[PDB]
Design a protein around this nucleic acid. Structure first.
Ligand SMILES: [Mg+2]
Ligand SMILES: [Mg+2]
Ligand SMILES: [Mg+2]
Lengths: 114, 151, 127, 79, 206, 98, 100
RNA sequence: CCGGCCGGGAACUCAAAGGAGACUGCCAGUGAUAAACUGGAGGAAGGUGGGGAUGACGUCAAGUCAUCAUGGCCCUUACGACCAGGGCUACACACGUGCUACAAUGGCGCAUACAAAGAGAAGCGACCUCGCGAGAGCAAGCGGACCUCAUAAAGUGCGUCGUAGUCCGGAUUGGAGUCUGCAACUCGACUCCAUGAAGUCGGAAUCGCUAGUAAUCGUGGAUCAGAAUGCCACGGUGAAUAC
């Protein structure tokens, strides 16, 4: 309801709110509720704050919103520093997940201009 | 094909209570070859109709079967080229499949809960004539009311 | 005493044995509702029995395998037709009228060259 | 990615810089072994990465840590 | 390719095999190359001695090479010195012991390969191809043949274009899968070009 | 004692290759066990008869390799003395495994 | 079919199995979970001198008579359009055409 | 020691062969009593009952001299020969095949049921050990209805999710890896963690299909050191019309 400072995962199950949290995904929520000692069958609207602060303390061990994009940007600045092919391609605003580029990258390369 | 004039196959009756209509009722909705779950959700939806109608299933729909079933369809007679409606008598040998077809097309509708809850509510809607397959009957009646005495 | 029911329904070998005296139906040392009492073909394993006698006169001992759940549940429907032969004529002429005694020689067609399935042609272009 | 045990270094790329770590390498090097990566010893070089039509002189900063020579070679001319 | 070889579909049915031996797929290709290269060497060694057909067998790596000839007088030579010399080279190229056996044909007009070799010797001399075909077909029909289909194709007689010519005299069942027909293919490369022959002869029915 | 495992191509060849094994072992060889069908493998594949063009042209070639068991059960000496160095119905493969 | 191609298969196969392809104690025993001694380099030191003429991964594993990289099959030794012309000519033991 | 594991039977599931039986075999009839056909019992099996290889004179002088072949021509201290490296995967942009999709006849979790066809000796590898998984050690066993690849999947029971791009769906990149073969980025695949679109079942137009077919959900082979949704193949579930 308040975790992470900004995100309100209201009416989300205990681990579903953590999968929907900004920074982590599918298994880290399970890992958090296992390291904290909570089950995942009820929404966030039933667990009191006596444990929500503990969930927020336990998630303070990973990279969070403010450092997530900034570690990504540190890597991207390493790309703008080196000059390698993934810096060249990334410095032209091109799609994001592999190697094939010629015929089918149209969603993230945008529709055809002319 | 152009040569042979054969008809349809034999219809397997249902082992619970023999109903060709019900069998077709399921096999028109059948999808993808996964019939185990379809059987899990249709007979469960019909023993749940057994209370929605108060009586059994073969008579649950006979009060509404007629409502789905019209007297007319269209077949274009060509006297130089035409593509609009020309009314003709609908065949009863397949009017059953037509009636079980449009009501499952309507059963895909009303979608908020799962399948079994909604298709039986649609059966009640044809019992009290509040379905869109019930209005399809008047729609084909309108596609027949216009051009009479064609051929 | 002991009478055998054959079967080969849809690549599913039916091997049935019938005894007189009771009405138990055990599928490969497992019971009716343990395996498929509420599943596909839940009653055609009795329809041969429920055409004449099922509940307490004749008890069954089935071992059908080699396919899918539906194939195993139909292998018995066809095995009991061959098992009910202690009154061969009265059990065979009664059921041939309704069927259930044919083999249903249905074999899954193999992959045919070109045809991307048993019958599907690869997609055209025309142009 | 690459090996679990030992990064793949060619012997023509490795040794030419080994004894010149002592001296300074004085110059670009005619590298025809673009398939190997960089370790602290090779930082500061003006090496000539193979690219076909020519060999590109590339300065090796300390930031080129876990990367191979064949990656920043202009084989993708594209105008 | 509308017409299949009218023996490849009748091989293991009515007609004899030609590479008759059992083994496993660890030396099989080594047996195959040794068979092919030595078979082509023997057809390069005994062609003028008329080899109607050659059969290969590998029983327990003591192979049997059977050579069906029409003129064995020049095959054996002086009491078998040529054959005892040949037993050496086949075993050299194959690496396996070889038992070579000559077989005989009385009338050489029973093999389509043996007459196709005659056609190959015919149409490489600037001779009338009709005088070859129409003559061999009557020479075969007078001794007996319930069906014969002889085809010559290509540059025949200086056609300068693609042309096929066939002489069909009798019942040639290239579809019925109960009969026995002999058939083989040959080419003759004159200065004009190659000339291909297809010789079908139906004698046996069972 | 001689587990005889022979493998051959044809059923009208392996039958006449097993006839001699099962005949010689009764006149000399003390009541062999018997032959079992022993289902077979046929190596079914589709090999490209294709030339540079026309992928849709195929061939479906196979090799039918028959499988049979004999299993002479008794360790009789005249069995091995009758089955020392004989090979019949060429086109087959036989072995003498104790 | 090129003379040089068909000889290039020969120059590789004459030495691959004559060399490190069987002389392979310095192939896997050196490359293990053992000490991170010079061994990690000593693996590559020999291979830098070794030609890429001799490695199991290298050769195309094709037909012999043709010289053609395609059409070959692992079990035969011959390309497709030659092996079929010998097949239905009869020169393949027990190979014939059946159907289902 | 409810593992056919141990005696035992050689009934049986099944299996490789030899046969068998399906045949218009009989009957009603508009009709040239003909032919046959809708068709009835019989009938494990109804009309070529399954399906397949099988392509008839040939045709577009269709494609192929880069599968191979071999005239004719040409070059031949070069159009021959050899090494390293890049390319074919470069990309404003068309189109042609297919998987994933465009959620609730559905998604996630425990649980749990059954295939047939294949492959396996310079090759597969039970078992045990480490790991979330990928996969690394030890490595008996099989050139094979015995040992293995290899645990089939949708399924069945059940809980939850309940309409928002939401537990739908996952891609063209980040970060850390895992194997292969000298060798993984220009150029291999795979696993995990992190971000999360398009798209809300569609226009012109157009394609596949007469059954155990379509649709389909897993499996294996080939090619191979590695390298597919594809090619070819196995089987599970299982429709619709044919006026
Ligand atoms: Mg892009
Ligand atoms: Mg053309
Ligand atoms: Mg169409």
């Amino acid at each position: 309801a308040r975790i992470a400072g900004i995100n309100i995962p209201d009416h989300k199950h205990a681990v579903i709110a953590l999968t929907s949290i900004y920074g982590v995904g599918k298994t880290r929520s399970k890992a958090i509720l296992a390291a904290a000692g909570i089950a995942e069958d009820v929404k966030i609207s039933e667990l009191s704050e006596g444990q929500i602060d503990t969930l927020r303390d336990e998630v303070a061990k990973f990279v969070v919103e403010g450092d997530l994009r900034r570690e990504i940007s540190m890597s991207i600045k390493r790309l703008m520093d080196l000059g390698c092919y993934r810096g060249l391609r990334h410095r032209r605003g091109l799609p994001v997940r592999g190697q094939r580029t010629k015929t089918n990258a149209r969603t993230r390369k945008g529709p055809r201009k002319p | 094909p152009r040569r042979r004039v054969i008809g349809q196959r034999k219809i397997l009756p249902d082992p619970k209570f023999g109903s060709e209509l019900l069998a077709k009722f399921v096999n028109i909705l059948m999808v993808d070859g996964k019939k185990s779950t379809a059987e899990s959700i249709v007979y469960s939806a019909l023993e749940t109709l057994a209370q929605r109608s108060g009586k059994s299933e073969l008579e649950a729909f006979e009060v509404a079967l007629e409502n789905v079933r019209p007297t007319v369809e269209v077949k274009s007679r060509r006297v130089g080229g035409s593509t609009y409606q020309v009314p003709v008598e609908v065949r009863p040998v397949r009017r059953n499949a037509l009636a079980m077809r449009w009501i499952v097309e309507a059963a895909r509708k009303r979608g908020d809960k799962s399948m079994a809850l909604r298709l039986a509510n649609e059966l009640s809607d044809a019992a009290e004539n509040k379905g869109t397959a019930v209005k399809k009957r008047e729609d084909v009646h309108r596609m027949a009311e216009a051009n009479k005495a064609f051929a | 005493n002991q009478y055998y029911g054959t079967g080969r329904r849809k690549s599913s070998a039916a091997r049935v044995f019938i005894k007189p005296g009771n009405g138990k139906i055990v599928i490969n040392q497992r019971s009716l509702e343990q395996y498929f009492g509420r599943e596909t073909a839940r009653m055609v394993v009795r329809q041969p029995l429920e055409l004449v006698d099922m509940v307490e006169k004749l008890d069954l001992y089935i071992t059908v395998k080699g396919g899918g759940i539906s194939g195993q549940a139909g292998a018995i429907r066809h095995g009991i037709t061959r098992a009910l032969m202690e009154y061969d004529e009265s059990l065979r002429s009664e059921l041939r009228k309704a069927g259930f005694v044919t083999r249903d020689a249905r074999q899954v067609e193999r992959k045919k060259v070109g045809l991307r399935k048993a019958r599907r042609r690869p997609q055209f272009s025309k142009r | 990615r690459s090996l679990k045990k030992g990064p793949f270094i060619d012997l023509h790329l490795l040794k030419k810089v080994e004894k010149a770590v002592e001296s300074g390498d004085k110059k670009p090097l005619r590298t025809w072994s673009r398939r190997s990566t960089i370790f602290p010893n090779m930082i500061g070089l003006t090496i000539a990465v193979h690219n076909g039509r020519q060999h590109v002189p590339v300065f090796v900063t300390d930031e080129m840590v876990g990367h191979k020579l064949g990656e920043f070679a202009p084989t993708r001319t594209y105008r | 390719g509308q017409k299949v070889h009218p023996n490849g579909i009748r091989l293991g049915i009515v007609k004899p095999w030609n590479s008759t031996w059992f083994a496993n797929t660890k030396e099989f290709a080594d047996n195959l190359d040794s068979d092919f290269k030595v078979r082509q060497y023997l057809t390069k060694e005994l062609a003028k001695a008329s080899v109607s057909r050659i059969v290969i067998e590998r029983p327990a790596k003591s192979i049997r090479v059977t050579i069906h000839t029409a003129r064995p007088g020049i095959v054996i030579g002086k009491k078998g010195e040529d054959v005892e010399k040949l037993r050496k080279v086949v075993a050299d190229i194959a690496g396996v012991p070889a038992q070579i056996n000559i077989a005989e044909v009385r009338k050489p007009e029973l093999d389509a390969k043996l007459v196709a070799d005659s056609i190959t010797s015919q149409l490489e001399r600037r001779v009338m191809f009709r005088r070859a075909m129409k003559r061999a077909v009557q020479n075969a029909m007078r001794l007996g043949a319930k069906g014969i289909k002889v085809e010559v194709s290509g540059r025949l007689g200086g056609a300068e274009i693609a042309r096929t010519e066939w002489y069909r005299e009798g019942r040639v069942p290239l579809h019925t899968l109960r009969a026995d027909i002999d058939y083989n293919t040959s080419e003759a490369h004159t200065t004009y070009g190659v000339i291909g022959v297809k010789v079908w002869i139906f004698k046996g029915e069972i | 004692r001689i587990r005889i495992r022979l493998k051959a191509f044809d059923h009208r060849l392996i039958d006449q290759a097993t006839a001699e094994i099962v005949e010689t072992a009764k006149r000399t060889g003390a009541q062999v066990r018997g032959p079992i069908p022993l289902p077979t493998r046929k190596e079914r594949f589709t090999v490209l008869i294709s030339p540079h063009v026309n992928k849709d042209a195929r061939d479906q070639y196979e090799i039918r390799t028959h499988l049979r068991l004999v299993d002479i059960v008794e360790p009789t000496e005249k069995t091995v003395d009758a089955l020392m160095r004989l090979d019949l119905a060429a086109g087959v493969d036989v072995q003498i495994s104790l | 079919a090129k003379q040089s191609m068909k000889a290039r298969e020969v120059k590789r196969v004459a030495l691959a199995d004559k060399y490190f392809a069987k002389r392979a104690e310095l192939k896997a025993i050196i490359s293990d979970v053992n000490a991170s001694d010079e061994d990690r380099w000593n693996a590559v030191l020999k291979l830098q001198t070794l030609p890429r003429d001799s490695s199991p991964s290298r050769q195309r594993n094709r037909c012999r008579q043709t010289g053609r990289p395609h059409g070959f099959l692992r079990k035969f030794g011959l390309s497709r359009i030659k092996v079929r012309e010998a097949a239905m000519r009869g020169e393949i033991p027990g190979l014939k055409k059946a159907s289902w």
